[PDB]
Curated annotation (Swiss-Prot), chain A:
It comes from Homo sapiens (Human). GO terms for biological process: cytoplasmic translation; translation. Citrullinated by PADI4. Component of the large ribosomal subunit. May bind IPO9 with low affinity. Interacts with RBM3. The modification Omega-N-methylarginine is found at R44. This is Large ribosomal subunit protein uL4. The chain holds residues 54 to 316 of 427 of the full protein. Keywords: Acetylation, Citrullination, Cytoplasm, Isopeptide bond, Methylation, Phosphoprotein, Ribonucleoprotein, Ribosomal protein, Ubl conjugation.
UniProtKB/Swiss-Prot annotation, chain B:
This is Large ribosomal subunit protein uL24. PANTHER family: 60S RIBOSOMAL PROTEIN L26 FAMILY MEMBER. Residues 1-21 are annotated as: Disordered. It comes from Homo sapiens (Human). It comes from the Eukaryota. Ufmylated by UFL1 in response to endoplasmic reticulum stress, promoting reticulophagy of endoplasmic reticulum sheets. The lineage of its organism: Eukaryota, Metazoa, Chordata, Craniata, Vertebrata. InterPro entries: KOW (IPR005824), Rib_uL2_dom2 (IPR014722), Ribosomal_uL24_CS (IPR005825), Ribosomal_uL24_euk/arc (IPR005756), Ribosomal_uL24_KOW (IPR041988), Translation_prot_SH3-like_sf (IPR008991).
UniProtKB/Swiss-Prot annotation, chain C:
It is linked to Spondyloepimetaphyseal dysplasia, Isidor-Toutain type: An autosomal dominant bone disease characterized by early postnatal growth deficiency, severe short stature, genu varum, platyspondyly and severe epiphyseal and metaphyseal changes in the lower limbs. Higher levels of expression in benign breast lesions than in carcinomas. The chain holds residues 2 to 159 of 211 of the full protein. The modification N6-acetyllysine is found at K15. The gene is RPL13. This is Large ribosomal subunit protein eL13. It comes from Homo sapiens. The lineage of its organism: Eukaryota, Metazoa, Chordata, Craniata, Vertebrata. GO terms for biological process: blastocyst development; bone development; cytoplasmic translation; translation.
Length: 263, 134, 158
RNA sequence: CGACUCUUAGCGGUGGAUCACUCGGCUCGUGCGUCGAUGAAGAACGCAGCUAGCUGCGAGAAUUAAUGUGAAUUGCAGGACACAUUGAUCAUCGACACUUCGAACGCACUUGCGGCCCCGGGUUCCUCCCGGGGCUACGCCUGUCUGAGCGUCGCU
RNA sequence: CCCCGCGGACGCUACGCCGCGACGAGUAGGAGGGCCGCUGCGGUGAGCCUUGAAGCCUAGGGCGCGGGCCCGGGUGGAGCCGCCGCAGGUGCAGAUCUUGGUGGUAGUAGCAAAUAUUCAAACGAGAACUUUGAAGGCCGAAGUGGAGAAGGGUUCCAUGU
RNA sequence: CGACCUGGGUAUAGGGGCGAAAGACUAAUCGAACCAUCUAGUAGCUGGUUCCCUCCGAAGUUUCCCUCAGGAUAGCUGGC
RNA sequence: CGGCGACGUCGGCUACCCACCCGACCCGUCUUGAAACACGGACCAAGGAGUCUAACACGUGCGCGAGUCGGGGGCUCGCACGAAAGCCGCCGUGGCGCAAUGAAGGUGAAGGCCGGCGCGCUCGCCGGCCGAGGUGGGAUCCCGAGGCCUCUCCAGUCCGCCGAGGGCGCACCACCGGCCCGUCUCGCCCGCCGCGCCGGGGAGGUGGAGCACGAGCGCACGUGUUAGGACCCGAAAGAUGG
RNA sequence: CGCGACCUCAGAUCAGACGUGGCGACCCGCUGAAUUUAAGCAUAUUAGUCAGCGGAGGAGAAGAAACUAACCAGGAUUCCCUCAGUAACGGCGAGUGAACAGGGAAGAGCCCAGCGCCGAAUCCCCGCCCCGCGGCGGGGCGCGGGACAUGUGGCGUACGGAAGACCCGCUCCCCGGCGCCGCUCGUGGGGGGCCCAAGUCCUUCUGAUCGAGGCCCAGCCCGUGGACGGUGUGAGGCCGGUAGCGGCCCCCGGCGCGCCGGGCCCGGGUCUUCCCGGAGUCGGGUUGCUUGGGAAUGCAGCCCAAAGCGGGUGGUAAACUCCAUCUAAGGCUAAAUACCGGCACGAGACCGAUAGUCAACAAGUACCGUAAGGGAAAGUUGAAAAGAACUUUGAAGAGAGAGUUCAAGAGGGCGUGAAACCGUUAAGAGGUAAACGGGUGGGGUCCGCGCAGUCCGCCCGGAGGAUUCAACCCGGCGGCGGG
């Protein structure tokens, strides 16, 4: 808010022997404003309590290792059909979920052939879901230029932009991402992992250089290596049912002993 | 979408420019589509509405194929008056009903040296775009 | 009032600090403006190095940093004298010169004149009038071999 | 039985909460970064066919010219406007114009009064009257003209 | 080696489900939970909506210990909500609180300083108050008279409402 | 009939004026006018401090303090 | 097992009105004590008060880990989003941590066992190994005599459970030793380009926010304290210029 | 006893110029408090801050060492990070508090006086002629004026410079112009103007629709355009726009070539001989302020008052000694940096008419005060005025009919229309003021598809229908296992 707001009044308190509250009152006469309360957060036309200020620390810094971690988690989750469908991405006729297309897509020039590619990849149902979800936002966002809202569609991750950006970019829901500049705000759109992603082949081949293997470090980040697992085998049912685990267990106590009525 | 950093997409700014537009750009705002026959004869789609050209009302209470000659372009109220598009008020006098020009279709153009100059200007630019994208 | 264990803190907020607060919301815009000016300058000086003149090898003063070597303000006049470069011609061919720096030893002096000799050998000098090359450089050496160097000229390494 | 009073509901009042709207603000960022004696900022008074305010303008006064545009302006009226022996309106704005105060400048002001030079009229050149026009502030620089000094000298 | 039967309830959102035992006051104060509530942002609901959004009203039906919430009816006429996160100018009975509105008081106090009005007529829808006439009175020339200065600024004068 | 009453014009301005003196008067303000700002001045003092349920649950005592309507300190409390 | 059931009755009621019995003083607030003859409150609507910044402390979550952190800069079509994100590594400068102690000059954290020798003189030259000592507790872990079985036995084949005792002992606690810096007391040796008013070393006390095989750094959240208008409202005053 | 020259002054409505005043967010020079904190308070703090005064510009100021250092040395200024809440100051209390080095943004250097040399080489003004007008210049002329030896210009400035010799290299600058440029350069440079894709298709909802279904072909059509706004809903295709190294028109500007014209004048190395510096200033004392600067950091007043192998600094006063480092008392200078005023834009996890600016509106308005100054309230009919013709009562306000509209249960302060409060109607009640908790009862309004009361699995019996069952064959697909 304006730092001058509510404090342009020259008002002063009337004292205490005049049967009115000791709030400052506007000086003078001849107007409705005269004798009215001022400067208080409880006063109409006064100053708000603790006025908001521009030095509010709007920004946060996150460690580069944690930001790299989140990209790795987002990419790994976008390879599992259960997680992508739980985002709601209509990947039912998609032939393979780490969906990779040839490099010819990077040189597309028309929106017509971008649409045709998505239809033949069976990714057009995700676009139709974005169309169905175009509605008006509820609230004051309409007055503040955020009038339309819609769903997020697939993410096209390319390596070299030879017109692919312009061929897309008129399809609602499509966001295009350079593989060298991956964004967590686009890969996990609402903070939830599992966005549908379509990879160009050159982008797909470049992931092992960008983030590395566990055998070799990344060749494009100069100190980064893939994070380790604190649990190698997450198949809990397989572990519990394994004969070595079952050999060490005592027999289950599956009889319920309810309260005995004392006769 | 819009990428020009000097063109605004702010709703308040756009509405302010619309409702406070000077009359010489209110002329361009108050444009109308041409009929399918005129859109074929001249390679143009739209045209600013004019005091003496003939239109059909295609939306509202006065829909129909009746051709009416425009009789007044009221740029202050963003409406045009057409010949038979009128109603009786209480005392029994006829008053024209204002209609936005975007809801009419021009069927005959009032032609003069300026209209033909604009019509060929719009057609030439459309042809240049056709041969650019060819 | 103090409460249990703590640190005796002395904040310097007794002096109406809120009237002099520098926010940094124009930091991303300042980085853009600086970057654009850098690009515009590099375009202006077409084949010349984009960074600027070549700077000398300089040892850092104190006992904390005398094991370190960085770039200085300009070549001293004794260095240019034994490199055979006029102190007024040096600035026109991209050699920075610092007339107020002396040379206490011959090791740093000789290291900087080797630097000047190597730069003078790497230098392509376009003729003042392109039609008539007087003493600058052969046309083959400047036909396509002249590119804008990026980064400091011959960067100083430890 | 009514009246009165209380409670609840329907309807009607009084009132303007709520919600929805927003040509307004606030905040951040960018690019420019430009007033004035060739008279600024500000103020006053005027200016429209019907007009009080706001807005615009200056006795050429809700505007002239020029350029772009290309048939309106509009609340009513009136009247143009072959749109080619050129054009409504709007925009732009480089030509022209721009009352009185105001640093405000002949002197002075809660009033008013000069002086000088030209021009015209009553005169029918001589200087009185009327009107018109141009000048008439302070400080200061360069130069100019006119000067002052029992200042320092020279010739006589 | 089950087989004339080829068959056999539910469960286990593991942050879930189940069992047993004891316990239950509370100011100042602390902590936890909140599928309590408000506003906005990122996701999501192939969400809702002119065959009717928000808001409001309701002797309507209910749910929850509660904060509150859902549904029916009416009015209204254009936007709104659920879930996962994020962020607050986020919840009122008080502050002789601020602004606005409204009561009782109450058809009450009151419309009582300087003697005083009455008759007839006219106009007019309408007359205690206007106008005219007739009376009776007052100011009583240091005036309730006739003119000015300051101040006001059109109040002056006609006509009309 | 006087140290008389009074118009207008002038002069004196805030720690200043002016006072036949009452701390009087100085634009309904005077034992220091009014206006704006410093200023959201400070307050150990008064008033208020906005949803629900569950669990735990006090102190008015010790020592020091220009300390006695306040703090620090130990104690008592809750949470992890 | 019985009765009863459509234009009159059946069930329901949180909710509407009324009646009766019992109980029941008006809330907020300060206070030992409020219904108070204590203060505020006529009524309704809307607004209305622990906030943000900085700095600490501890807890909690996350990443990396003797390190950690790019926050300032730069590079990446300059720009819908994007003022975002990404990257730099001879951009790690630097901050904090990794070393303390003394006013400072300065100095600055490895011992244990077995051997031959001067004298195994409270000890100096080495050897060999090992690599932060020991005592008492100490989760966990290891060994384990002896038992627990079948239709039965003379005789071992494979492993599962209980198990007196014994062992290695995490973290942590108590204690005793040891090492580093300051300062005392006592005392005898050693070094040499500077033979010195030089330098080093020992033993026994004592002072340190120390060592004794690291735990920190960055980010986020919570609570507490503090400086800021600082939970909100409130002086009598003071100052500057009109 | 006049006339001249000079010096020092004066006047003029003399010829030609310049200054004043405004704004003042940022900047420079001064002046300068107190509230406050210290739990009192006086030093201190607030704070070199508010207020006051003066002066500028698009930036300003600063700035090329009388510097930092003590190193193996760096090298103008300004800004950022860090140094660092540190050294230091402080009733050593509360509190205050820099710099160097290091890393970056930017980067740029110079000019006089003096000492000297050169026939004052120099400059201003007024006339005349010519080329052009644009920030009035060039060229030429004037036995035309003036300035100026009480010192103009060229060389030259501490980084040394100058003059002679000797040797080497002839090397090539600036400005105004004609024609054309490549045209400028993240993809024309800038400003202005005019244009450029695709549904108003079929059936329906509605007052109106931009709504809802559909549009066989791989899917209505365009998409480098699915930003936004308008339009009687909610629109990529209705309109303006949006996208595009899209098009067309006009104007302006800064980089080259061929040529024109004008000025335009020697550079380096070695040797020799010469020449070298800013004074009521430094510095000292004292006083007051200021600073982190502490036996005194800086500034100023007064007094004293310099030197030249000198002077300044070397963060503890002083003497002696060595060393290091710079060269004061003259001047200019871009960039990086700042910007709550102005012009023009863009955006937002902001506010949504008691909020957000005081001001969404004829707001610094109305109004108040003598004045300085103080300073509001106030948004919404409807898609369209279609703003209620006409009849009737009344003097009118106001009504009853009628009419418009989807709606006036939208009627010019007119979207919705809460509560308090009030009128009327309906029901109930009423002598312990009302109101409340618990428990019932009566009445009432509604609800229940209430009114012969669930349902469905197997079996038995009855009477009926049937892509008719098991087992086999063919094919397809799965699950599990295989040295
Ligand atoms: Mg406000
Ligand atoms: Mg809402
Ligand atoms: Mg009502
Ligand atoms: Mg014109
Ligand atoms: Mg007079
Ligand atoms: Mg004389
Ligand atoms: Mg109990
Ligand atoms: Mg309890
Ligand atoms: Mg609040
Ligand atoms: Mg209230
Ligand atoms: Mg009465
Ligand atoms: Mg009376
Ligand atoms: Mg009488
Ligand atoms: Mg009189
Ligand atoms: Mg009168
Ligand atoms: Mg007295
Ligand atoms: Mg106050
Ligand atoms: Mg008390
Ligand atoms: Mg109280
Ligand atoms: Mg008491
Ligand atoms: Mg009480
Ligand atoms: Mg009592
Ligand atoms: Mg009392
Ligand atoms: Mg009290
Ligand atoms: Mg009271
Ligand atoms: Mg009250
Ligand atoms: Mg409220
Ligand atoms: Mg970044
Ligand atoms: Mg380092
Ligand atoms: Mg132990
Ligand atoms: Mg010990
Ligand atoms: Mg604490
Ligand atoms: Mg406060
Ligand atoms: Mg005082
Ligand atoms: Mg003159
Ligand atoms: Mg104090
Ligand atoms: Mg105090
Ligand atoms: Mg005090
Ligand atoms: Mg000031
Ligand atoms: Mg000025
Ligand atoms: Mg400057
Ligand atoms: Mg300067
Ligand atoms: Mg110098
Ligand atoms: Mg530190
Ligand atoms: Mg200070
Ligand atoms: Mg740089
Ligand atoms: Mg000279
Ligand atoms: Mg629309
Ligand atoms: Mg649209
Ligand atoms: Mg179009
Ligand atoms: Mg365009
Ligand atoms: Mg010393
Ligand atoms: Mg307001
Ligand atoms: Mg409202
Ligand atoms: Mg009336
Ligand atoms: Mg309605
Ligand atoms: Mg209404
Ligand atoms: Mg009622």
């Amino acid at each position: 808010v304006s730092e001058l707001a509510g404090h342009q009044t020259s008002a002063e308190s009337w004292g205490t022997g005049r049967a009115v509250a000791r709030i400052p009152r506007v000086r003078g006469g001849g107007t409705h404003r005269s004798g009215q309360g001022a400067f208080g957060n409880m006063c109409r036309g006064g100053r708000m309590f603790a006025p908001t200020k521009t030095w509010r620390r709007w920004h946060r810094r996150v460690n580069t290792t944690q930001k790299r971690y989140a990209i790795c988690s987002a990419l790994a989750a976008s390879a599992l059909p259960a997680l992508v469908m739980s985002k709601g991405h209509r990947i039912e006729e998609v032939p393979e979920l780490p969906l990779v297309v040839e490099d010819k897509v990077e040189g597309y020039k028309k929106t017509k052939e971008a649409v045709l590619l998505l239809k033949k990849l069976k990714a057009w149902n995700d676009i139709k879901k974005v169309y169905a979800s175009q509605r008006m936002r509820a609230g004051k966002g309409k007055m503040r230029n955020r009038r339309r809202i819609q769903r997020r569609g697939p993410c096209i991750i390319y390596n070299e932009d030879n017109g692919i950006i312009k061929a897309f970019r008129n399809i609602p829901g499509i966001t295009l991402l350079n593989v060298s500049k991956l964004n967590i705000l686009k890969l996990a759109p609402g903070g939830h992992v599992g966005r549908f992603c379509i990879w160009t082949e050159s982008a797909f081949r470049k992931l092992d250089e960008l983030y590395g293997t566990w055998r070799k470090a990344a060749s494009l980040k100069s100190n980064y290596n893939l994070p380790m697992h604190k649990m190698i085998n997450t198949d809990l049912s397989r572990i519990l049912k394994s004969p070595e685990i079952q050999r060490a267990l005592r027999a289950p106590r599956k009889k319920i002993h309810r309260r005995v009525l004392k006769k | 979408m819009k990428f020009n950093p000097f063109v605004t997409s702010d709703r308040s700014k756009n509405r302010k420019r619309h409702f406070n537009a000077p009359s010489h750009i209110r002329r361009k705002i108050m444009s109308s589509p041409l009929s399918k026959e005129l859109r074929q004869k001249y390679n143009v789609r739209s045209m600013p509405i004019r005091k003496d050209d003939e239109v059909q009302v295609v939306r509202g209470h006065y829909k129909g194929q009746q051709i009416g000659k425009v009789v007044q372009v009221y740029r202050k109220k963003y409406v045009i008056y057409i010949e038979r598009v009128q109603r009786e008020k209480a005392n029994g006098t006829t008053v024209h009903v204002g209609i936005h020009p975007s809801k009419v279709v021009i069927t005959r153009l009032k032609l003069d040296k300026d209209r033909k100059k604009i019509l060929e200007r719009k057609a030439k630019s459309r042809q240049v775009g056709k041969e650019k994208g060819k | 009032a103090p409460s249990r264990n703590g640190m005796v803190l002395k904040p310097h907020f007794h002096k109406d600090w809120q009237r002099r607060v520098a926010t940094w919301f124009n930091q991303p815009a300042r980085k853009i403006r600086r970057r654009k000016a850098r690009q515009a300058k590099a375009r202006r000086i077409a084949p010349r190095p984009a960074s600027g003149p070549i700077r000398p090898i300089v040892r850092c003063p104190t006992v904390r940093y005398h094991t370190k070597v960085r770039a200085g303000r300009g070549f001293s006049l004794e260095e240019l004298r034994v490199a055979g470069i006029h102190k007024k011609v040096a600035r026109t061919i991209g050699i920075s010169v610092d007339p107020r720096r002396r040379n206490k030893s011959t090791e740093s002096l000789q290291a900087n004149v080797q630097r000047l000799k190597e730069y003078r050998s790497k230098l392509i000098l376009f003729p003042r009038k392109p039609s008539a090359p007087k003493k600058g450089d052969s046309s083959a050496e400047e036909l396509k071999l002249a590119t804008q160097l990026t980064g400091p000229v011959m960067p100083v390494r430890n």
